[PDB]
């Protein structure tokens, strides 16, 4: 399709065109500093995914339950009716909580995995 082509589509029709907005991230002084900056932003996003256990995936399911105080809309009110921009404008004050919960859950899963893999 194209870059941001699903920007105006609902959240359930924009979760299929993910490999198209992912590949177009493409990862004297004025340009080189922005190439390095783009690399740094890409690597920070990859590091976030990795710390969460989502490395190598574009759609990653986690073990963190959804708190109704973050958003109390039903699935048919989010995936079918809202766009990703409206969702970002909704859940934005809470990303510093969700990200912390995701890394804590991954740390617990990693320690449980090394304990299970040392059982025998």
């Amino acid at each position, epitope marked *: 399709l194209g870059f941001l082509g699903a920007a105006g589509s609902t959240m359930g029709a924009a979760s299929i065109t993910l490999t198209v907005q992912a590949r177009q991230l493409l990862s004297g002084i004025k340009q080189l500093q922005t190439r390095v900056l783009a690399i740094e932003h890409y690597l920070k996003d990859q590091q976030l995914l990795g710390i969460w256990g989502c490395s190598g995936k574009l759609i990653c399911c986690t073990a963190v339950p959804w708190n109704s105080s973050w958003s109390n809309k039903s699935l048919t009110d989010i995936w079918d009716n809202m766009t990703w921009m409206q969702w970002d404008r909704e859940v934005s004050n809470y990303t510093g909580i969700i990200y912390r919960l995701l890394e804590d859950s991954q740390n*617990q899963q990693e*320690r*449980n995995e*090394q*304990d*299970l*893999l*040392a*059982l*025998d």
Partner: antibody
Amino acid sequence: EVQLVETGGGLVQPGGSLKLSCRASGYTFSSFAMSWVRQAPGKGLEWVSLINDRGGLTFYVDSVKGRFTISRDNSKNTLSLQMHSLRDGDTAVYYCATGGMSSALQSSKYYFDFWGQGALVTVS
Amino acid sequence: ALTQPPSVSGSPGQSVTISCTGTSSDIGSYNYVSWYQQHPGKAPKLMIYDVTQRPSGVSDRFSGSKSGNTASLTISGLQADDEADYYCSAYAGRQTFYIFGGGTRLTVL
């Protein structure tokens, strides 16, 4: 001298629920994988369930899977086992035991080191 | 489960062996056998863990070994205070976990 005191037990009727609890003292609590072990009258010992030192991992004997829940609280130094349905075959003395597992950064503790005095569970 | 002779006896001062036989997945594959001494009432006490190790507080009168798929606990120089039910256990695996055995009522003569 470590002390495991199981406070619970009594009589239930087939289909009921019962919770057991075990308090530990004399040693660091959040460093030992605790377990429960049943001794039916006139019979030997049978392992029921195991919980890791952190409480995140639980293991059960196949005969109780889906009916028993084992949980621990490292801030209160307590272990608990909550049983549902409670069949006639579950009548036994339930012993609180310390041991059965390790955190992978410590030596293997595949043995039940410290036991309690035993709670009596009767099903009728 | 694990087979263990229902009872063994002997006179004071003699040695006695309490065997425990399992399968290849239980005792043979895993050298994690252990033995407990349970006097009537109270609670089982750990006597032996691993094939040859004993916990602190247990004297060297109690020992044991493993050969093939058979484990055995040996008590030398039996005292009157050893009249207890002995149980063997072993780590079967991450699936079946600990499998105990029947009790060996030891009645010193």
